[PDB]
Design a protein around this ligand. Structure first.
Ligand SMILES: NC(=O)c1ccc[n+]([C@@H]2O[C@H](COP(=O)([O-])OP(=O)(O)OC[C@H]3O[C@@H](n4cnc5c(N)ncnc54)[C@H](O)[C@@H]3O)[C@@H](O)[C@H]2O)c1
Ligand SMILES: NC(=O)c1ccc[n+]([C@@H]2O[C@H](COP(=O)([O-])OP(=O)(O)OC[C@H]3O[C@@H](n4cnc5c(N)ncnc54)[C@H](O)[C@@H]3O)[C@@H](O)[C@H]2O)c1
Ligand SMILES: CCCC(=O)C(=O)O
Ligand SMILES: CCCC(=O)C(=O)O
Lengths: 379, 412, 412, 379
């Protein structure tokens, strides 16, 4: 389902780049995927086994990088498909990294912390021979957190005997992690929103992980909204003390609208600059409508990826010995988010002027990968 | 669907054994499965990519063991199912080996010899971190041969720098291999089939034998069984088969394959389809080709007194019941085709020991394990489980050892 | 014969330093040399085998470092000699790197691109146990390029399973490389040549420059030196050269190579032989091709005030003396072409650090080391050793660090 | 010098087997060769550096196997050439092994035991990354002994941290070595001499390492000789108490003559069966003369190689855990010396009947190697 859309999106992009179907077959299918059986024992002695996956999609540009999600609906193909988005995303942001992802078919709610810990450990253990700081670097995803990374990390240290901080990302700050991890996506969305209005009055549909920091860094904001709504105060709201208190907003009248959380309500937004703060804030129709309407949409794969850049800098930090200051890490995100958007402005002019920035982004993502593979003699 | 079948057979025996469905769940699933993408550049510059799998089913009793098949219809699920049967085969014969198997989705016929080498090398290279003399020892299966094993071998020595002969089995005798291994599976099937006939249907001499498949298993099965005084009245391959109730010259039959492509083109006999062969009149039927070839629909029509399973997983679970209902004796593959794995256990053992087992010591090592495992099965059937088919008894033994070993290691 | 020359130059400086001939014997010899046999299958099935070397000269100051050249005349002895100069170059510039170099006896022109890849991969594969990010980091030399480094890279990731970018330097910028590295050697030679001209012959502007060689070093040397206001009045390659006292358009010159094969075919100028070029009238002569190109016989005829050595080992030891006798200043290669190794030190350093050095930080990192090493050499010449040529002073520094480090490690 | 004769002998044999010159180029040149600088410090503080080599000729059939010689005249090319003889010899005796050899340019006489020890250690150390029980297995040669192997062994244990007995051969019996090492060549020469007279009154020019044991096992001997001569007692001399006492013999009248230590004295030997106990007991002329004269000559490469077979069994023993009894090791030499000679009798009939047994032996040696390489896709 996610797979089939990702393969489709890919073949669409391959024809546009002028690629053999055989060359796109390569790009499509993952290099390696492993599946592992995890037996977990409950307090009562009850035995349950759980199946999990690591899809290592592509490593043209570097070692596989990407998080691990726990969930009762995860499937081999969801993991693979998520592999692929990571390949393209890392490519676009010019990271020394390829695409990987992992998942386990489990409902974490139905497990104690002791069982999760045991589950997290055994997954790592069953796949470690294709993990490493220089081969495959997992991270948090859905139902996975810095705590999951500490269990991953400790179990790795148990097997290899090395305190290799950089093998996992999203780690707690006291175990090789870095501070910006929380304001990464935000700093990301913010620095993209700013230099995008420069080339081409803010609203933010959200104030959680991303929205709040997107709001703070940009003001350094006429709208705000929660799962319970917000206020279109034209003053510009106080971004701090909105935290002390914890359809209209989209259609509202602004210069930048930042979804941080359809064809119907698409031709009504008055924002002439979209900075997609989460994944999939628009539909396949609502780009048609935004493109026709001449309103610039900066997509998921770039605007929301201050997080994976944050994990890169965490990775970089570990290898440098943890010397990178928070000041210097901040600047590395902005450098890596500016550089990547200016290559997507410069590719956008010299060719594919006709085309949407999502399609052009992932084009450039594939172009960079195929280019690396050609140079290594892999096609 | 091999998976589905093999899982049903495991539950059948699990419930008999008194195992929780949670335990059987653990046994059922492979510990680790890898799929890998293999890209091949034709001589004209056409790029073809192919998918392969290595299924590492169970490692309670030792490192994973088993063959790799190349074929257009191989699938993740069947290689996992072939994994399963390795586990039981290795357990039944008391080998320090778990169960594993590999497969690639490819039609070797549509590739050149240079393409298959490249293919073979990249397969190994893409999984080699979960291979080893003490991790996972592959071997030949369908459309794989000692040459395949030499490309595998050679590629592993390049990657690691070590001439560890024991990482692959079924190797040419000049590269750490052992001559018996070429024909150990067929010799095993022949040996078991004769013991079975002596104990059940009045012996092997004069006996009318149909063999489906005429490759490394089927040919050698037929050769040895013919040397032993059996009458081989039917033979077949992918191309179809031939029944001659006056017997078939096996060597000449092979020549007809070599000069023709298939064994339907045997001149002295009646051409039959594979389905027709399976239900043709015979004393002993030996499926020595592919799985699930006898099912709920043709099993009522099978005419043999005794089925000896050369191939991995020839009958469905429903076929197993019917054979039981009809009083038709089936020698499990877990025991009948073990001459392969036993032969490669000795190949392996000889490698670690440094090459100091002669070809006759080896031959004896293989035949003896084979018979002893038969006599164990036979005796254990008479004493306990005398109302169950043989595969059930074999499986009981095989599954019990594995669970025992998992218990001790604290895995269960 | 590069070996012979480089050994003489080392004894010259050793005796000056007051080292026992036993010590110089140790310094002289490479710690380890590998030769390997590489077999290549042409598209028609013709088998060609080629010999390559990796010379690991000295590792006192760190892991071995240096390029690989492909060429029909490369020899064990020259790669060992090129090793030596790496040691001194790495020591003079305070890099945590010993000296190494590689070579293959092959004419790349007579191979296809598919043959050179195979060639490049098997070279690495046959020595890879004595390579590593912390053992021996190769890089481009003559007839080797970022593409070569990518085949090397890719083959190493296959063998080991690890994407350690830092195992090779001069890599394409999209595979762990750094853009400055493409032109760091030429930028270094240009930078040093300008500083040298400002301090000795009244500056670089208007200055008449002959460059022998027009590849990765010579072209970029000429480009930057031309950007800096020098007049490049002669250029050459294997095909011969051209002198135009009105200056040569460097970019257009490169185009004449690209569309023609050689730079003799430059339209606006006088065609000369390489020998004629070397002794042609100029302010600054920059050998940026091969070794031993100036010797006892043409050194008396060299017309330049200042020789800047782009290439490794351009003058013989006898040429060095003559240049001294005649008062002709020679900037050692150990310092002039270091922009390469400095550029790849930063490429390497950036890899281990995770890719977080920008291309401008890198550029500055390289230029600064280059100048500082010049100023050190210059100042150290004025204070001690003011009666010795510059190469002697540089060598004094370089050799002394190495012996110091060997002492502390108890190797000497 | 040794090189050029070995390359020549090889190209002679390649044409006879019907091989491309490009295929013989491969076979000729070694796969890898390394050279290492060894600095040794004397008691007086004097520093001396010594250059040494490991030539790893071919590994078609298995890991490189072959000894290390010390000597002031050893050269890279002597080592390479010695590589090659080992490749062919191992092939002929059907060993799971290829050809390697090593040497150091040193006069051991001019070094103390402390300096030799240090020299022996550092050689191993400088090459260990291409040594191992499964990659390259050195042994004793000239000016090298079981004591040299103990220093090799200990230094290896120091680097790797593993007591891998099988990495070196010729070890003292109390450090992974085996008993037959002394009567190996003898048992070799003896069992070859016996089953050769069967197919087709003994003399032995020598009674040292090989001669004595060749004499004992065969009697279980009308001639004997030393560097100081012997006695042609027609009784058959007492082989034991000849040890208690420590041109004519060759020309003498016997059925088997066994040189254990030229055209001129070649047409006079009355022996109709030569079992070459040392290397090069005949000349390139004296085979012409022996062949013409119809007198069967069993060459160096097979008859004297009970030693390398002995080291194989030592190797085999180490890997099996040192369980092989002296009884069982004895039988393994004879099995490996019979098998190898019966393949050289069976190849000799089916083809190359016209040809000498030296040329036919090394033919079969090359045929087996090229065959293995073909199967591995190496030519
Ligand atoms: N001895 C071994 O190396 C070995 C090892 C492992 C497993 N096995 C098992 O034994 C069986 C035989 O394999 P093999 O090694 O002889 O293979 P093979 O490739 O040597 O020969 C296969 C034979 O089966 C025939 N065949 C293929 N598809 C067929 C079909 N659909 N219907 C009928 N015949 C068909 C082929 O034409 C050929 O005659 C397989 O089930 C295999 O899993 C054998
Ligand atoms: N920047 C680098 O990558 C690098 C690295 C290490 C060493 N170097 C040294 O710098 C020098 C230049 O090498 P490069 O990288 O520019 O090589 P290159 O292969 O890029 O170019 C070689 C150039 O020299 C010319 N040449 C070749 N043989 C010649 C001859 N006999 N006479 C005159 N010209 C000849 C070629 O035609 C070409 O113009 C060499 O001595 C090399 O050892 C350069
Ligand atoms: C040696 C493995 C044989 C095999 O895979 C089989 O018998 O199925
Ligand atoms: C980075 C190595 C460069 C080199 O080999 C040289 O400058 O000679």
């Amino acid at each position: 389902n996610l797979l089939v859309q990702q393969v489709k999106k890919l073949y669409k992009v391959g024809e546009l780049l002028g690629l053999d179907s055989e060359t796109i077959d390569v790009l499509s299918q993952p290099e390696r995927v492993m599946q592992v059986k995890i037996q977990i024992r409950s307090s009562d002695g009850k035995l349950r086994t759980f199946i999990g996956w690591r899809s290592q999609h592509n490593s043209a540009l570097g070692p596989y990088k990407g998080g691990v999600r726990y969930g009762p609906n995860v499937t081999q193909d969801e993991v693979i498909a998520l592999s692929m988005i990571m390949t393209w995303k890392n490519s676009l942001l010019l990271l020394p990294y390829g695409g990987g992802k992992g998942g386990i078919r489990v409902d974490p709610k139905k497990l104690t912390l002791k069982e999760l810990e045991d589950l997290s450990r055994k997954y790592v253990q069953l796949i470690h021979k294709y993990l490493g700081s220089d081969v495959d670097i997992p991270a948090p995803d859905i139902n996975t957190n810095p705590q999951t990374m500490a269990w991953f990390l400790d179990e790795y240290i148990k097997i290899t005997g090395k305190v290799d901080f950089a093998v996992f990302t999203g780690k707690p700050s006291e175990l090789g992690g870095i501070g910006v991890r929380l304001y990464s996506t935000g700093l990301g969305v913010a620095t993209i929103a700013r230099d995008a209005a420069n080339k081409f009055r803010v609203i933010i549909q959200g104030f959680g992980n991303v929205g709040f920091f997107t709001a703070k860094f940009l003001s350094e904001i006429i709208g705000v909204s929660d799962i319970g709504g917000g206020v279109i105060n034209e003053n510009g709201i106080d971004v701090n003390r909105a935290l002390e208190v914890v359809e209209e907003l989209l259609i509202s009248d602004c210069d930048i609208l930042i979804p941080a959380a359809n064809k119907f309500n698409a031709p009504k937004v008055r924002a002439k600059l979209i900075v997609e703060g989460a994944n999939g804030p628009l539909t396949a129709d609502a780009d048609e409508i935004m493109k026709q309407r001449g309103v610039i949409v900066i997509p998921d794969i770039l605007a929301n990826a201050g997080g994976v850049v944050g994990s890169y800098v965490e990775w970089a930090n570990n290898r440098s010995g943890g010397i990178i200051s928070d000041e210097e890490a901040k600047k590395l995100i902005v450098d890596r988010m500016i550089n990547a958007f200016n290559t997507l402005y410069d590719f956008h002019k010299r060719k594919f002027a006709d085309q949407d920035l999502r399609t052009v982004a992932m084009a450039l993502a594939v172009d960079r990968v195929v280019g690396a593979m050609k140079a290594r003699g892999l096609l």
